[PDB]
Amino acid sequence: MISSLWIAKTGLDAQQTNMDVIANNLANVSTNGFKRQRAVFEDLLYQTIRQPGAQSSEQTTLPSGLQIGTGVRPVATERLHSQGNLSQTNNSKDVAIKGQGFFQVMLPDGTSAYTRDGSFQVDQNGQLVTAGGFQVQPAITIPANALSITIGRDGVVSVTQQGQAAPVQVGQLNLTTFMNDTGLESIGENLYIETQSSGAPNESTPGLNGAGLLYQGYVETSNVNVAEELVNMIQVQRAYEINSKAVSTTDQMLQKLTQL
């Protein structure tokens, strides 16, 4: 029933959201191709008891008005699309993308999603899919009796057959780039889809039009810096405690007022 109480409630909720994003970032620190989240807030509206610069008389004005804030509102929890560390695995079916772009994935319903985690397998029919059963949009199929699979610096992928003394090309991995990479809405299983925030994706071969490069045998780890999450957690805890203290003070003054 007191403005200070609602203001402190908004502060508590903001700190709670900050703690939630910190917890989620610390949770999946080992997830391949995971981008951390950062929450940004803003101040709410203002109640103007006296308008600043009001004409207080014929030739004098108020240098500063009287305004009371109404709390804090979290603007958005964006995802920081930095570059993850390239590990090494010495496998044949995982690729790390260095730079920008995404692998297109054909969802079962019919539409397409976009992923950054490169860990590919082969389904029962022989076509290249991601971990989760989803197949790549160009529909690259690995033939049987395949001695080895090689993926060049660009998107071309070839497979060495039993004979023929020469590898045979089987397809190309073109990747799509956006304009507002932080505007893609993220769904589960390391997948993203586009909205009004991000522009129409443009697909290209790796290494051109600002696209990245494909390295075979590597994998892109999450860009979560565990060293600073702890100090952020400390600051969040202290701020939450102080907001709770403000709530308690408001309750105390209300209680000692109503005792009359």
């Binding site: 060293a227 600073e228 100090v231």
Partner: protein
Amino acid sequence: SFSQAVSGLNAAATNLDVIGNNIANSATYGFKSGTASFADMFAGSKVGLG
């Protein structure tokens, strides 16, 4: 007052990162070792910023 300490922590972490990169990239033929350089920050005077 966490700003100055956090900035110093980040600077020390960067220095350790550079040292680890130099020591790990040993035996690389075409390699030149790196070195980080630091600089203080002040808003006006008597106001440190890490």
